[PDB]
Amino acid sequence: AHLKNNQTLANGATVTIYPTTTEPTNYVVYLHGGGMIYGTKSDLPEELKELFTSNGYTVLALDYLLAPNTKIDHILRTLTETFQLLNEEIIQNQSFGLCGRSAGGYLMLQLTKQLQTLNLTPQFLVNFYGYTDLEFIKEPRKLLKQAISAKEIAAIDQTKPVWDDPFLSRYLLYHYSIQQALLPHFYGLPENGDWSAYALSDETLKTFPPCFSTASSSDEEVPFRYSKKIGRTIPESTFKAVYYLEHDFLKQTKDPSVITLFEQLDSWLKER
Structure with a gap:
């Protein structure tokens, strides 16, 4: 039956499936935002989900492990595992694309x-x-002007693995770690600052499939040069800027700039 539904994979990851109206289908795997510390596959905007399903892509919105509970190296390994199971069960070697929001874009590229x-x-x-x-x-x-106290984040568990944070309850832990200079520690990054293992080379990007890449010039959380590189260094790719908006502009799908960008994405998807 073609109804939105959740499935749990062998390793404990769950996926929210949004089927298209027809079979056979193609797929897009969606990776949510939240800095690899908070958030949920449920953050997928209705409008973005529709851009995919209306174009014949069943959307697979996927869980991934969150830091500091799980370190980035492990998050990435588990994501590969999870994709392989997702392909076993659902995609079954059919064509698929990937879509990533903020940290989800990094995860997608890795x-x-x-x-x-x-x-x-x-x-x-x-x-x-x-x-x-x-x-x-x-x-x-x-990013947040007001100082977050230790008290406000004391209740957030950092020990056990976490697949999903459906109510964004770990949002403060993320911003706390930033304010306190603990984000690398939370992520498990080398203390010596050599994070080359976590970086994708231009060489590598040159081997990637076509990408539609977008970011705001006014992004204060991730320098938008990254999305320029992503849409320009990957061959046969497109970079579309938006101007004067905050980082996470998928929160504002009704903004005229975001509406225009979705038209651009829709047109680009129709050329796959």
């Missing part, structure tokens, strides 16, 4: 590199203000 090794290349990629390395988190950022 997954892509790993999938090439398993003979599972995506047909295309859609990057909403992601990134290709973690260097930018070394730079000071002021």
